[PDB]
């Protein structure tokens, strides 16, 4: 399927113990969807002072669309020293890595894959 319905957990920033997915854009764009397909992926939610405290490259998932059975449209950008690589819409937040952090909401989200 072109896109997989997926419910993310949405982690405060302080909890979240893994803050990225690796050292490259490449990297943490195939680390991201590999955590993606397994169920293994957090979603920290971008307002004032999140993103210093997460390491680059950071992976956002952004609005592909203005969404199917509660579902936004969603697709990957990775962000390095303020360059983009992918174009799309509204952040919904950055990805990390999920390893047992509690959840303090899902955000239903249909993802491209
Ligand atoms: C290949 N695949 C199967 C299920 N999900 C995928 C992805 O690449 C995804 F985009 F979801 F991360």
């Given amino acids: 399927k072109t896109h997989v319905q997926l419910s993310l957990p949405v982690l405060q920033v302080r909890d979240v113990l893994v803050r990225g997915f690796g ?5 943490v764009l ?23 405290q997460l390491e680059q490259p950071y992976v956002f998932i952004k609005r592909s669309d203005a969404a199917p059975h509660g579902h936004v449209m969603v697709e990957l950008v990775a962000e390095l020293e303020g360059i983009q690589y992918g174009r799309s819409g509204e952040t919904l937040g950055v990805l ?11 955000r239903k989200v249909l993802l491209r894959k």
Avoid: W
Avoid at 30 to 39: I, N, P, T
């Fill in 23 to 27: 050292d490259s854009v490449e990297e």
């Fill in 96 to 106: 990390v890595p999920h390893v047992g952090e509690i959840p303090v909401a899902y």
């Fill in 30 to 52: 195939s680390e991201a969807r590999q955590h993606l397909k397994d169920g293994t992926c957090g979603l920290v939610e971008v307002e004032k002072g999140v993103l210093p």
